[PDB]
Design a protein around this nucleic acid. Structure first.
Ligand SMILES: [Ba+2]
Ligand SMILES: [Ba+2]
Ligand SMILES: [Ba+2]
Length: 327
DNA sequence: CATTAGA
DNA sequence: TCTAATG
């Protein structure tokens, strides 16, 4: 967590590069398990040779560690940080809709900048287009104060369309977080569960609602069970318009909510942790259900949930308010 | 790890 | 169809 820091940090630094600037999925995969193990190790790596003893740790990386240990840096590292192509690859990527594949492609053509991008709006798809459009706002954080605002509206229209709707705003927000990145809306309906062969429209209904009133301002991608978008709080009595914000709406079988709800709310560790525990408690938790464990090794058969509670009761734990689901 | 776009 | 991009 800190005694093996630089290494893991230097390491990840290294792995990301392979993945991104290069297409070295394996090298990449390499640097990572390394950065992984050297991270778990209970002692200050004093030398490469030391480290090397490790699993994942080969002569290539060990070599890296002494060089880092020795001098407070790394050339490969200094070199890459300096390299313009590589710089450009890291940069275009932040564009929503821009992946590494695309990143290199653009660069190859010579589209290294923000402006490059505008000048060639044509070479961009709709997604990438919007991405480009709202580059600033997309990067910008979302004050909780806003999340309240957003969540308000969202709930109203959901209700307006059908009162049988169930929408919850999942994420760190859900968890009290003073600020969020985008808004996560897990949606459901009685009329939509495990078997009941869809009702795509169910999704379709609300999107349209959010639109009609001007909440949704763009579509990144809309499917029959998972919409991806852009929104904007109505800009007041002028002088202060609100930044475009990424939203995300997903349909859900009413018979899979709470798990997913439980799940999407995190935290990553809370999650994992509760999960660890259901295992002992003779269960299995996953984004969709909760099954009872069968000694033979495994078992199936999803227990019935009607609330975040049920899941709790099941693994006989203390109900934890989303607030304190931090870990 | 699953959904969407797209070409 | 595949393959990239989000989460
Ligand atoms: Ba080894
Ligand atoms: Ba991106
Ligand atoms: Ba998200």
């Amino acid at each position: 967590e800190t005694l093996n820091g630089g290494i893991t940090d230097m390491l990840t630094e290294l792995a990301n590069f392979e993945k991104n600037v290069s297409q070295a999925i394996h090298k990449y995969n390499a640097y990572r398990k390394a950065a992984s193990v050297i991270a778990k190790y209970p002692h200050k790596i004093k030398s490469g040779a030391e480290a090397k003893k490790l699993p994942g740790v080969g002569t290539k990386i060990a070599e890296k560690i002494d060089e880092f240990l020795a001098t407070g840096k790394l050339r490969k590292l200094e070199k890459i940080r300096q390299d313009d192509t590589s710089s450009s690859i890291n940069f275009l990527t932040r564009v929503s809709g821009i992946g590494p594949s695309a990143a290199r492609k653009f660069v190859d053509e010579g589209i290294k900048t923000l402006e490059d991008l505008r000048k060639n709006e044509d070479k961009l798809n709709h997604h990438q287009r919007i991405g480009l459009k709202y580059f600033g706002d997309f990067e910008k954080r979302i004050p909780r104060e806003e999340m309240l605002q957003m969540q308000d509206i969202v709930l109203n229209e959901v209700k307006k369309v059908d009162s049988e709707y169930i929408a919850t705003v999942c994420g760190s927000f859900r968890r009290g977080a003073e600020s969020s990145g985008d808004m996560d809306v897990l949606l459901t309906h009685p009329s939509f569960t495990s078997e009941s062969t869809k009702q795509p429209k169910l999704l379709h209904q609300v999107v349209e609602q959010l639109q009609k009133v001007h909440f949704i301002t763009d579509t990144l991608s809309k499917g029959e069970t998972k919409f991806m978008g852009v929104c904007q709080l109505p800009s007041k009595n002028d002088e202060k318009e609100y930044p475009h914000r990424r939203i995300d709406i997903r349909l859900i079988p009413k018979d899979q909510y709470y798990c997913g709800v439980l799940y999407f709310t995190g935290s990553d560790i809370f999650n994992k942790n509760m999960r660890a525990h259901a295992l002992e408690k003779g269960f299995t938790i996953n984004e969709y259900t909760i099954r009872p464990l069968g000694v033979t090794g495994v078992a199936g058969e999803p227990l019935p949930v009607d609330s975040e509670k049920d899941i709790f009761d099941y693994i006989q734990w203390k109900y934890r308010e989303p607030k304190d689901r931090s870990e």
